């Protein structure tokens, strides 16, 4: 109970919230994968061009 009360006090001291992190996390992952593919293609093309 003492630990529960201390955690309640900490939650009274600090806020923070979450609304759309998980929704756009997938979009960020997709964008990162697309950029990785594009970068790999660019590096391969540069080596082939050299």
């Amino acid at each position: 109970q003492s630990n529960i009360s201390e955690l309640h006090k900490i939650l009274r001291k600090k806020g923070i919230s979450t609304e759309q992190f998980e929704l756009q996390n997938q979009e960020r992952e997709k964008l990162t994968r697309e950029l990785d593919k594009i970068n790999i293609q660019s590096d391969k093309l540069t080596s082939s061009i050299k």
Partner: protein
């Protein structure tokens, strides 16, 4: 939640720039391939005529 959107925008901008670079590289590689095949066929014809 905001760094997520900032990173998404940065990834999109870098992807656009790398896509322009990739298009330029594709043009250069196609020109190089055309030049190489042109020189190879000219060399083959010259040796046959020789």
């Amino acid at each position: 939640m905001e760094e997520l959107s900032e990173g998404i925008k940065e990834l999109n901008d870098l992807l656009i720039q790398r896509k322009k670079t990739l298009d330029d590289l594709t043009a250069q590689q196609k020109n190089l391939q055309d030049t190489v095949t042109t020189f190879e066929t000219i060399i083959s014809e010259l040796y046959d005529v020789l």
